């Protein structure tokens, strides 16, 4: 099973209209979270949404990475600016409290696209701007649509992007203290 740590009531509305009840889960986030490592572990316990995802996954702070109600944790954001640098450093900093989640690689990313053209009956799926550059030499009927946001896809694209995701991994270099001190 998996848990989607997606954003807002919109994406969980589409997720309720899309997901499998047995396999795929979900949870939104209430709002803006601050810098992750400026706050004590009892103050991550004072924070509300972090305690919510400590209780839903069953991995509360101060314990070994076991008895997890969700074997997978996925986070599903908007690919313009809404979660590309806002949800992810704070969420990866909070998930850095258990390095055994990262050793098993239990946090993934589902890439919503950037550009979609509607060609024929089946629209195309440029995931990034680099694939949009590299495959503009052979792509017909260039009617452009921007996917700057989770709302910019309908229920059908949300359906084939949950039921057929890509599950991009999270970052893990040889040191897990040198790269998270960049933002401060």
């Amino acid at each position: 099973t998996t848990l989607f740590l997606t954003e807002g009531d919109s994406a969980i509305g589409y997720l309720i209209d899309v997901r499998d009840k047995e396999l795929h889960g979900g949870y939104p986030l209430r709002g803006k979270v601050l810098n992750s490592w400026g706050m004590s572990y009892a103050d991550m316990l004072k924070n509300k949404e972090l305690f919510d995802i400590c209780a839903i996954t069953g991995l509360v702070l101060g314990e070994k990475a076991e008895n997890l109600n969700y074997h997978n944790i996925a986070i599903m954001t908007d690919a313009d600016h809404d979660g590309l640098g806002s949800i992810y450093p704070s969420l990866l900093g909070f998930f850095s409290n258990w390095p055994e989640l990262f050793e098993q690689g239990r946090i993934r990313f589902v890439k919503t696209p950037v550009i979609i053209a509607h060609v024929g009956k089946k629209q195309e799926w440029f995931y990034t701007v680099a694939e949009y550059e590299s495959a503009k030499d052979a792509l017909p009927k260039h009617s452009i649509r921007y996917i700057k946001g989770l709302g910019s896809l309908e229920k059908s694209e949300y359906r084939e992007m949950i039921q057929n995701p890509v599950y991009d991994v999270v970052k893990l270099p040889e040191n897990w203290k040198e790269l998270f001190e960049m933002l401060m």
Partner: protein, 433 residues
């Protein structure tokens, strides 16, 4: 006597700024502005999801003398296929939900005109403009089946309050198609969108009930609640006052369509038997039955206001305005097609005289050809269109093709000549789907 200059100003704040809709288009005053802004952007790319800021900041020159925040959230609230039955205006974004009836933002959300709107709102461009000069939308748009019956409208003005209820698409189609024939008017049936409970009358008034299912001795699956209950206001208004007595408890197991609320009883409750007082305690405690009231008050084709007790006379008045406003289109198409018939006949006759070349054509310098064609009895009236002639049509194949077009125009002119209101309106009523 100038304080009435304040008060009549109040009468342009309590007449033309009213929330009362119209019987004909089924539209609010702000809905014509957001529709006109969306179609002003539709043009060729009627499929490019235009930004809700561009709609919302675009209604300034349409004549809406209020805030852009009102249309900015109005377009969010009326682009929902789950709040309303008939899809009028589509889009990509959040437009509300039965979990939470809000949008996620208004700045990552883009809206679109629907092709079903143009399947259902012909004679939009024929619509007469409002008495006020600044109103760039017309006075009322023109549907095939009305938007008063479909999807519902609710509001409260000064002294009058509309609560018009959504109805099912096939029954509104059958109602307009059957009251067009002048028979006993079928009142349309009501189908709330994504509602698997039961909608029935009690006494002149509708009730809505969802679905509750006994699953054990002390367990419940409310598969559906009635329509005006979301998750958390129903939890905090009813289910949490039931929780604080220690009576029941809830599980969050909401389904694919509708709800999935599983409720487990506790032992400090009634838990009565015999299947008439336990169900009484259920729809008095869980609230499985919800009642309402009806008052069909709606502004007519002018600025006055009229009240109906039923939608039968509403459908009758809609189709009796629709009869004349299709008849106007019939007369306009007849007067277009007769002059277009005489013109196409003139051009086919002149392409016969071109591919013959029986007109002297060379050496007619200083336009002596059209000084010869200014005295022909019909060629004169459109000399400026008989002269746009290349050499490319001298071969006879295009002459015979324009003669075939002329014969095709004749039967066409006979088809739109002999026709009337009823068959074209019922062909539109057939081809809305």
């Amino acid at each position: 006597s100038i304080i009435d200059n304040e008060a009549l100003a109040y009468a342009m704040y309590t007449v033309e700024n009213r929330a009362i809709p119209n019987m004909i288009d089924g539209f609010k005053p702000v809905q014509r502005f957001v529709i006109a802004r969306a179609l002003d952007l539709a043009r060729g790319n009627k499929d490019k999801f235009h930004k809700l800021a561009s709609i919302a900041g675009g209604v300034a020159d349409l004549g809406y003398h209020h805030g852009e925040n009102s249309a900015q959230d109005a377009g969010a609230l009326m682009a929902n296929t789950w709040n309303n039955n008939f899809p009028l205006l589509d889009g990509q974004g959040n437009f509300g939900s039965r979990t939470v009836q809000k949008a996620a933002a208004s700045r990552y959300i883009f809206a679109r005109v629907s092709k079903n709107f143009y399947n259902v709102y012909k004679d939009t461009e024929y619509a007469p403009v409002h008495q006020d000069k600044e109103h760039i939308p017309p006075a009322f748009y023109l549907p095939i089946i009305p938007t008063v019956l479909l999807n519902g409208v609710s509001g409260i003005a000064t002294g009058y309050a509309t609560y018009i209820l959504p109805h099912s698409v096939s029954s509104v189609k059958k109602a307009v198609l059957q009251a067009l024939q002048g028979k006993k008017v079928t009142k349309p049936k009501v189908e709330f969108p994504e509602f698997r409970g039961e909608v029935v009358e009690i006494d002149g008034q509708y009730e809505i009930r969802g679905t509750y299912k006994f699953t054990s001795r002390t367990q419940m699956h409310i598969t559906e609640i009635p329509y005006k209950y979301d998750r958390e206001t129903y939890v905090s208004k009813i289910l949490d006052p039931l929780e604080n007595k220690g009576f029941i408890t809830w599980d969050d197991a909401c389904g694919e369509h509708g709800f999935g609320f599983k409720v487990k009883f506790r032992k400090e409750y009634s838990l009565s038997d015999n299947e008439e007082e336990r169900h009484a305690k259920i729809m008095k405690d869980f609230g499985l039955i919800e009642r309402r009231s009806q008052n069909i008050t709606v502004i007519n084709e002018k600025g006055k206001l009229q009240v109906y007790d039923n939608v039968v006379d509403l459908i009758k008045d809609f189709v009796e305005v629709r009869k004349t406003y299709v008849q106007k289109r019939i007369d306009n198409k007849i007067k277009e097609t007769e002059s277009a018939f005489r013109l196409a006949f003139a051009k086919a006759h002149f392409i016969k005289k071109v591919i013959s070349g029986e007109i002297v054509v060379q050496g007619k310098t200083r336009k002596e050809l059209t000084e010869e064609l200014s005295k022909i009895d019909m060629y004169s009236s459109y000399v400026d269109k008989l002269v746009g002639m290349n050499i490319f049509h001298m071969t006879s194949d295009e002459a015979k093709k324009l003669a075939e077009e002329a014969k095709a125009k004749k039967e066409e002119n006979e088809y739109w000549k002999t026709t009337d209101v009823v068959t074209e309106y019922t062909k539109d009523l057939e081809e809305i789907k």
